[PDB]
Amino acid sequence: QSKPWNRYRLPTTLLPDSYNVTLRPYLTPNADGLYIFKGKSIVRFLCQEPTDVIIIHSKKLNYTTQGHMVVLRGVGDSQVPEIDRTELVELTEYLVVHLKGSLQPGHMYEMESEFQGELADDLAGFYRSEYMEGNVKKVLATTQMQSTDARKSFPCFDEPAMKATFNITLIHPNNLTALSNMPPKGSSTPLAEDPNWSVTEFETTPVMSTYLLAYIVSEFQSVNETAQNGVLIRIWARPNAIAEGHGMYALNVTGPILNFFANHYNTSYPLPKSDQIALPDFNAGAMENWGLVTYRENALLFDPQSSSISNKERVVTVIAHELAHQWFGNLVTLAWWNDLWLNEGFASYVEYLGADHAEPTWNLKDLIVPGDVYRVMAVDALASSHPLTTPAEEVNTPAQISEMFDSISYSKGASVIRMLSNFLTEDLFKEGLASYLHAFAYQNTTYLDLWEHLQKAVDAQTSIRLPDTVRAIMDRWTLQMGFPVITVDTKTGNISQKHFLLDSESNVTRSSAFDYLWIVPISSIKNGVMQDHYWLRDVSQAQNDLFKTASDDWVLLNVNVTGYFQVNYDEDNWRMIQHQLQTNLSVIPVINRAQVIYDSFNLATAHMVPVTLALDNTLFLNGEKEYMPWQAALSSLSYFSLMFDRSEVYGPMKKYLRKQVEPLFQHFETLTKNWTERPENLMDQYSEINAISTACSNGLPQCENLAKTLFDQWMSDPENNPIHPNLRSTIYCNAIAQGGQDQWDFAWGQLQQAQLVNEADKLRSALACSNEVWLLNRYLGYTLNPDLIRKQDATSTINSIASNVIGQPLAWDFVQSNWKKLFQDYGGGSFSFSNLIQGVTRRFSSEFELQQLEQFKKNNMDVGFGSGTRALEQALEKTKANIKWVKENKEVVLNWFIEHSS
Numbered sequence: 001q002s003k004p005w006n007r008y009r010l011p012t013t014l015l016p017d018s019y020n021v022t023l024r025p026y027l028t029p030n031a032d033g034l035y036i037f038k039g040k041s042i043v044r045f046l047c048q049e050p051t052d053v054i055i056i057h058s059k060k061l062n063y064t065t066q067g068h069m070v071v072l073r074g075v076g077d078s079q080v081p082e083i084d085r086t087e088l089v090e091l092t093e094y095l096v097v098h099l100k101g102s103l104q105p106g107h108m109y110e111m112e113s114e115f116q117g118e119l120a121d122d123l124a125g126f127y128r129s130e131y132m133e134g135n136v137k138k139v140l141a142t143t144q145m146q147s148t149d150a151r152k153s154f155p156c157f158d159e160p161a162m163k164a165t166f167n168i169t170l171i172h173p174n175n176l177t178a179l180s181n182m183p184p185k186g187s188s189t190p191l192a193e194d195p196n197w198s199v200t201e202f203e204t205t206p207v208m209s210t211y212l213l214a215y216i217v218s219e220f221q222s223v224n225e226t227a228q229n230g231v232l233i234r235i236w237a238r239p240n241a242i243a244e245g246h247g248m249y250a251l252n253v254t255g256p257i258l259n260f261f262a263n264h265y266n267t268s269y270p271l272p273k274s275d276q277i278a279l280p281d282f283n284a285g286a287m288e289n290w291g292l293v294t295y296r297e298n299a300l301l302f303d304p305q306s307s308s309i310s311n312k313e314r315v316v317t318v319i320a321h322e323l324a325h326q327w328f329g330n331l332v333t334l335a336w337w338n339d340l341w342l343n344e345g346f347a348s349y350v351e352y353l354g355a356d357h358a359e360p361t362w363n364l365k366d367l368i369v370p371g372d373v374y375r376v377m378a379v380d381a382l383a384s385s386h387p388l389t390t391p392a393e394e395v396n397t398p399a400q401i402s403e404m405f406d407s408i409s410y411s412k413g414a415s416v417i418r419m420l421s422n423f424l425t426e427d428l429f430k431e432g433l434a435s436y437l438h439a440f441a442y443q444n445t446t447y448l449d450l451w452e453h454l455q456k457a458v459d460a461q462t463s464i465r466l467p468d469t470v471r472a473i474m475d476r477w478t479l480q481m482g483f484p485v486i487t488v489d490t491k492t493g494n495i496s497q498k499h500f501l502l503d504s505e506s507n508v509t510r511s512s513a514f515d516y517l518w519i520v521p522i523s524s525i526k527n528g529v530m531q532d533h534y535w536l537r538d539v540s541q542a543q544n545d546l547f548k549t550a551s552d553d554w555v556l557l558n559v560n561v562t563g564y565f566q567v568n569y570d571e572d573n574w575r576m577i578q579h580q581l582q583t584n585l586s587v588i589p590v591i592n593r594a595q596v597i598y599d600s601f602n603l604a605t606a607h608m609v610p611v612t613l614a615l616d617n618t619l620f621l622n623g624e625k626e627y628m629p630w631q632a633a634l635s636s637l638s639y640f641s642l643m644f645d646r647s648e649v650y651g652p653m654k655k656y657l658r659k660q661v662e663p664l665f666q667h668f669e670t671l672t673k674n675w676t677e678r679p680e681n682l683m684d685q686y687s688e689i690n691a692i693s694t695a696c697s698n699g700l701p702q703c704e705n706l707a708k709t710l711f712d713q714w715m716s717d718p719e720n721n722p723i724h725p726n727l728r729s730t731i732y733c734n735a736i737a738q739g740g741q742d743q744w745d746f747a748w749g750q751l752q753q754a755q756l757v758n759e760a761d762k763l764r765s766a767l768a769c770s771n772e773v774w775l776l777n778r779y780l781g782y783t784l785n786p787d788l789i790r791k792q793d794a795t796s797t798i799n800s801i802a803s804n805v806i807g808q809p810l811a812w813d814f815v816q817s818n819w820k821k822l823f824q825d826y827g828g829g830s831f832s833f834s835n836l837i838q839g840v841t842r843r844f845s846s847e848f849e850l851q852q853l854e855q856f857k858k859n860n861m862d863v864g865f866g867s868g869t870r871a872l873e874q875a876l877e878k879t880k881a882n883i884k885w886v887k888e889n890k891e892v893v894l895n896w897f898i899e900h901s902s
């Protein structure tokens with residue numbers, strides 16, 4: 001019998017009712033330089049089963065309670081046993097209260113404690129964030145409990161199902177503002193022991209999980225709106241950010257988004273107010289704390305003067321995502337972290353729906369396809385992938401919990417949930433989702449509870465018919481890893497599925513309960529006309545006249561890539577699709593125009609089509625005006641450029657791309673009125689951005705001229721930047737490429753005085769585009785100077801120089817030479833030797849370069865490789881793969897590009 005305090009999961013003998021928590025951050029160091037916070041707490045809990053021990057979470061807290069580490073009382077007229085001893089068990093992060101007798105079922109107890117911890121700059125629990133305002137370093141106090149850090153701020157039953165109400169009080173300097181999940185009860189009052197401090201009490205939370213608590217003390221200010229139902233909406237930020245109007249876009253979209261979700265979920269927004277706060281350098285990105293959502297600044301703030309359209313898109317979708325959680329995740333909470341994918345996957349899907357409500361002309365819903373579907377398919381098409389579901393009993397430690405937060409959970413979660421909504425229809429999906437939210441409000445669930453409520457909605461209607469239960473179908477997509485390639489022989493209409501792997505030689509060793517067979521929803525379009533929907537059952541092989549064609553017809557599966565799979569055809573059908581795209585592309589949905597490209601390049605990698613068939617699939621692009629198909633091409637070819645841009649292959653590649661992109665460049669030249677005015681909607685702005693990037697990086701004289709003109713123009717008038725933020729990264733880069741030290745030094749000056757991170761990023765990246773060796777080397781010289789280049793930016797900048805074909809050997813030489821600075825910077829802030837290794841070795845594709853990476857490894861005899869130790873072996877393995885891919889492909893690809901570049 002193991003001792004319960006040596007077990008990672010809490011006992012179920014005691015359940016919390018409600019907490020009082022009072023926290024007091026000290027934002028002035030104790031002069032040996034330590035920042036602390038002090039706290040006091042009381043937890044009221046109910047005994048379910050008799051027990052003589054109280055086990056509660058505590059992490060990095062010192063206790064100053066009078067007597068033992070806690071004081072224990074009976075609620076009402078309950079007696080309480082005497083404490084034997086209290087002890088802290090660090091490994092399982094427990095405070096353990098051993099009693100002289102047993103607690104009694106049905107009785108309630110209150111346990112009071114007094115404690116303090118470091119207010120560290122560690123982004124965990126109650127922690128400090130330092131930032132600059134003019135001359136002054138400012139320090140604020142803020143929280144990040146996700147996942148298992150509530151216990152780092154106060155002792156609590158820190159598991160998501162053990163929900164309770166919380167009464168938060170902040171004691172804080174009297175000129176600072178205090179925020180928490182709920183509104184303040186009233187005005188703050190002076191702390192009697194020292195009136196320089198004030199006390200702010202907050203209203204009682206609803207029943208809620210510990211990981212969703214938040215409290216913040218700062219000088220921040222807000223912009224505000226009162227929705228029509230009296231819900232107060234505020235955006236909080238640095239006083240200077242607020243004064244500059246950088247909060248306005250967020251404020252603009254928040255109201256519409258909250259409105260959309262209340263209707264979408266058929267459930268009122270469950271709180272009296274919504275705060276969102278922009279934090280400088282919040283590395284976690286965003287966190288959905290209930291009623292007080294935190295964001296990194298660049299994710300919430302928007303500067304119309306200097307921010308691009310893609311930045312606007314990031315803001316509205318990140319907001320939609322976090323607000324989605326205010327019902328799904330926060331109101332109804334997954335019982336355990338093994339089900340995280342459902343929570344994060346769900347938000348990662350509906351973020352597009354919410355944002356689409358706020359920006360209905362942008363067609364944002366499409367973006368899930370490039371953004372999540374094809375993104376996650378890259379890693380789910382590997383033998384080393386994993387199922388969405390993990391047994392709850394395998395997820396115990398805080399480290400194991402953290403491993404839940406990955407690509408598969410978010411992006412495959414989103415993909416499979418989107419599929420599910422689509423095959424149910426959205427109306428049906430919403431009905432089940434509403435049923436689920438109403439049944440489990442303020443409680444906890446597993447994914448089986450959602451399936452059950454969706455099944456109830458299916459069962460209550462007659463129009464949508466499924467080949468099996470919702471659970472049986474979703475089991476195929478959740479219990480085994482990966483996804484199928486669906487192959488169609490249009491001569492017969494034979495249709496097959498197999499587990500798709502990019503590496504046709506991989507051994508899959510993870511076994512599946514289903515032998516890697518799925519139940520697949522298959523929409524299809526024939527000669528531009530929608531066909532009846534089809535379900536592939538759990539069989540290798542089937543046949544249907546839906547997928548049989550005559551010789552002048554074509555068929556195309558998976559309309560809008562709603563299904564989580566990729567599609568291959570016989571060659572003849574590929575040809576027919578190609579001809580259609582050549583003659584009238586409008587007959588095929590824009591998403592599927594992209595799909596044909598995405599899938600075929602993946603199929604070529606897996607050796608299922610020839611690489612030339614994939615390249616053929618790009619031939620239609622000379623007439624393509626729209627964003628997505630062009631993005632599919634650019635994403636799929638970035639590897640070809642990586643492999644070939646130092647080779648004889650490159651000339652014909654450039655020439656071909658110039659040929660393809662010229663007419664699009666010409667299109668936007670007219671449409672934008674000589675580049676004076678951007679296209680109106682997002683997709684077309686993105687397309688223009690890509691067309692100009694593509695034109696310029698491939699050496700179209702017209703684009704090269706445009707870039708030189710604008711940058712000359714900016715240089716003759718530094719205070720009035722003539723270059724629209726959408727075009728900045730291309731135009732800067734190309735203009736510095738064409739120019740010398742005049743252009744470089746000017747842009748350097750501009751970088752040194754950029755007030756805005758996003759504009760600093762663009763400049764830093766453009767500076768690496770110089771074609772002078774001596775400039776690139778001098779630039780490399782700067783990257784380790786913290787006065788000239790921020791440390792957190794050092795490896796990014798080296799990677800950018802490596803990205804330059806001329807900068808490749810310079811960066812590689814530089815990394816090798818100054819490698820003995822692991823011992824100045826695996827202690828001087830993380831650094832990320834891992835990202836730096838991947839970046840500088842990314843190009844390697846020959847035996848000779850492999851011999852060099854091997855030779856560089858042979859400084860194993862000390863200093864090692866830090867957090868990049870495994871990245872190095874990944875580089876040696878990827879170089880092997882590249883050598884093999886280049887030998888197989890060089891000849892065929894050269895001749896294709898030669899053939900097709902006119």
Ligand SMILES: *[C@@H]1O[C@H](CO)[C@@H](O[C@@H]2O[C@H](CO)[C@@H](O[C@@H]3O[C@H](CO)[C@@H](O)[C@H](O)[C@H]3NC(C)=O)[C@H](O)[C@H]2NC(C)=O)[C@H](O)[C@H]1NC(C)=O
Pocket residue numbers: 020042110167
């Ligand atoms: C968790 O915190 C709650 C808020 O502080 C505590 O509830 C409050 O207790 C206060 C004092 O115990 C009460 O305020 C006043 O106290 C004086 C004592 O001098 C009394 O006469 C009055 O009852 C009261 N005055 C007024 C105007 O109500 C509050 O009644 C009370 N606040 C509430 C209930 O909202 C909880 O007791 C504390 N929990 C535990 C377990 O200690």
Ligand SMILES: *[C@@H]1O[C@H](CO)[C@@H](O[C@@H]2O[C@H](CO)[C@@H](O[C@@H]3O[C@H](CO)[C@@H](O)[C@H](O)[C@H]3NC(C)=O)[C@H](O)[C@H]2NC(C)=O)[C@H](O)[C@H]1NC(C)=O
Pocket residue numbers: 032034036037062116117118
């Ligand atoms: C929680 O309690 C911990 C244990 O009491 C504290 O950790 C101790 O921090 C002390 C001061 O930061 C260190 O003691 C000494 O500090 C003086 C100056 O303050 C130095 O001259 C000494 O070098 C140093 N003593 C030694 C032996 O090096 C201790 O290093 C440290 N003790 C332990 C056991 O880790 C925490 O500070 C306390 N945390 C909070 C937030 O209250």
Ligand SMILES: *[C@@H]1O[C@H](CO)[C@@H](O[C@@H]2O[C@H](CO)[C@@H](O[C@@H]3O[C@H](CO)[C@@H](O)[C@H](O)[C@H]3NC(C)=O)[C@H](O)[C@H]2NC(C)=O)[C@H](O)[C@H]1NC(C)=O
Pocket residue numbers: 248249252302304
């Ligand atoms: C938050 O929403 C606000 C209300 O919709 C937006 O306010 C709009 O800002 C636009 C951009 O400045 C203005 O549009 C144009 O502004 C120029 C400025 O000189 C004028 O030429 C145009 O006539 C004008 N166009 C229109 C259609 O009016 C709008 O004046 C203004 N609209 C309102 C109602 O005030 C904010 O832009 C938005 N904030 C962000 C960051 O997106």
Ligand SMILES: *[C@@H]1O[C@H](CO)[C@@H](O[C@@H]2O[C@H](CO)[C@@H](O)[C@H](O)[C@H]2NC(C)=O)[C@H](O)[C@H]1NC(C)=O
Pocket residue numbers: 018019020042043044165166167204
């Ligand atoms: C947190 O504050 C709330 C609201 O004041 C307290 O809820 C009260 O609980 C008492 C004691 O159980 C009840 O008699 C009252 O009916 C409750 N009031 C309301 C409005 O629900 C709650 O007890 C507090 N939590 C703690 C740990 O003290």
Ligand SMILES: *[C@@H]1O[C@H](CO)[C@@H](O[C@@H]2O[C@H](CO)[C@@H](O)[C@H](O)[C@H]2NC(C)=O)[C@H](O)[C@H]1NC(C)=O
Pocket residue numbers: 028136173175176219
């Ligand atoms: C809140 O009060 C504190 C203390 O009066 C102010 O902090 C001082 O600000 C000056 C610059 O104006 C600094 O030189 C001092 O070093 C600060 N002292 C400390 C201990 O930080 C603060 O500016 C006030 N804030 C607001 C929003 O009014």
Ligand SMILES: *[C@@H]1O[C@H](CO)[C@@H](O[C@@H]2O[C@H](CO)[C@@H](O)[C@H](O)[C@H]2NC(C)=O)[C@H](O)[C@H]1NC(C)=O
Pocket residue numbers: 262263266267268
């Ligand atoms: C949740 O959805 C239900 C069902 O659509 C809403 O109730 C309906 O509201 C419509 C719109 O006026 C009425 O015409 C229907 O007769 C109502 N149906 C039923 C069964 O009452 C309800 O308003 C929604 N609730 C929330 C909080 O959004």
Ligand SMILES: *[C@@H]1O[C@H](CO)[C@@H](O[C@@H]2O[C@H](CO)[C@@H](O)[C@H](O)[C@H]2NC(C)=O)[C@H](O)[C@H]1NC(C)=O
Pocket residue numbers: 015161162163335440443444445
């Ligand atoms: C986790 O959620 C479940 C519901 O999924 C909670 O169990 C319910 O408890 C409520 C209130 O006591 C009852 O109305 C229901 O009968 C219960 N449903 C069940 C048992 O299926 C459960 O309390 C939550 N767990 C914790 C620790 O709060």
Ligand SMILES: *[C@@H]1O[C@H](CO)[C@@H](O[C@@H]2O[C@H](CO)[C@@H](O)[C@H](O)[C@H]2NC(C)=O)[C@H](O)[C@H]1NC(C)=O
Pocket residue numbers: 489492494543
């Ligand atoms: C389409 O599938 C059918 C299988 O149902 C294939 O035809 C069968 O092939 C086997 C091969 O030995 C014959 O023994 C069976 O008699 C065939 N069944 C028939 C004719 O009904 C057919 O080859 C497949 N066509 C493809 C993959 O293009």
Ligand SMILES: *[C@@H]1O[C@H](CO)[C@@H](O[C@@H]2O[C@H](CO)[C@@H](O)[C@H](O)[C@H]2NC(C)=O)[C@H](O)[C@H]1NC(C)=O
Pocket residue numbers: 363366530559560589590591
């Ligand atoms: C495939 O996706 C396209 C969008 O890329 C869908 O077209 C949209 O359809 C909705 C409703 O018909 C309209 O409100 C949008 O304005 C349409 N946008 C465009 C650009 O056409 C299309 O409906 C989807 N096809 C299928 C079969 O689901």
Ligand SMILES: *[C@@H]1O[C@H](CO)[C@@H](O)[C@H](O)[C@H]1NC(C)=O
Pocket residue numbers: 505506507
């Ligand atoms: C997988 O096992 C087969 C056994 O036939 C072997 O040929 C192959 O090299 C192994 N591994 C990979 C990654 O191909």
Ligand SMILES: *[C@@H]1O[C@H](CO)[C@@H](O)[C@H](O)[C@H]1NC(C)=O
Pocket residue numbers: 528584586587
């Ligand atoms: C191409 O197809 C579209 C949509 O099917 C149709 O509206 C149009 O008539 C065709 N365009 C041309 C120029 O023939």
Ligand code: MET
Pocket residue numbers: 146284285286287288344405
């Ligand atoms: C992984 S920490 C970030 C917090 C939050 N759950 C998110 O998905 O952004």
Ligand SMILES: [Zn+2]
Pocket residue numbers: 288321322325343344347348
């Ligand atoms: Zn999320």
